[PDB]
Amino acid sequence: STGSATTTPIDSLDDAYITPVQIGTPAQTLNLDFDTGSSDLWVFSSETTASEVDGQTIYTPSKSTTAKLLSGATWSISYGDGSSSSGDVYTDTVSVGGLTVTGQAVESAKKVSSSFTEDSTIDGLLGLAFSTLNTVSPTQQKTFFDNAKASLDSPVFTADLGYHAPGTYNFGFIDTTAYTGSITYTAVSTKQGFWEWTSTGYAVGSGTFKSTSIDGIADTGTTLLYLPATVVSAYWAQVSGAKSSSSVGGYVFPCSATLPSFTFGVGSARIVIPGDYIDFGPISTGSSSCFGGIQSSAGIGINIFGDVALKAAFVVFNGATTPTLGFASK
């Protein structure tokens, strides 16, 4: 089997991407944030505190004839931005772009933090990291991809995120028309539960490539590219007026600037992120100071190849017995 679904930026800055997901019987369609950096499928629901729902589409398990409460199971998760959610668990039928999983753990939110409430465009998350990170207690549950894997034509899914444009998540197959050149595969460590890999280095604009090992995770659920302080300093040093701002919380730059591209290595291959991918607009409405899309990972503890990097590539998440990651230009 295979599945294929269109993924759409939630706003003009590509802050995140939502993908329609069918849940229950009859189908309830929610727009979820596919996140290769976590492993919980959770949703706004009829059980969510009313004051914490503001525009989201909710899952109502009482109206799904295939929904079953998972007895005694609860979940609770926190993300790097300090956001959080929690609740109970149902099993139900879940479909993504024609690919169906029965008995999928659907984590129903009772509580969500303010940042989720304030974002009316995201109805929940669909985790695509390794199931070892799933937070359901006392019995850990599997991801959508893990549940679907054996039935897929090939045990893979691919991410093709658009710059200011729609893109595609495919499951079970590789669309050879969706990229140029070849796909370069690179080793993955799953020891932290992530799609963790090692970039071979970087370049800034037309500058010479620096060969250096950068350990990081391919994470569709993070907006920006988070890299070592040395690398990030080297990038913004090429933007006149750019400065790291403590009050703002990272590198900002004059909105009138022309941003240089940023290249990262995948083995011997090179992925080029165009300069305008790195522009995340005014820090506040009307400001001429703009926020940078490449930031330091120093206060994170891990480098993150988030959407800024991934949307410059066609990315294969290969879930074979030994998983690997593939990158192609497009």
Ligand SMILES: O[C@H]1[C@H](NCc2ccccc2)[C@H]2CO[C@H](O2)[C@@H]1Sc1ccccc1
């Ligand atoms: O990019 C953010 C994500 N929010 C993206 C988003 C922004 C605006 C509107 C919708 C969605 C979530 C998931 O993880 C963090 O918060 C990461 S930044 C991070 C920091 C420390 C550790 C790991 C990641």
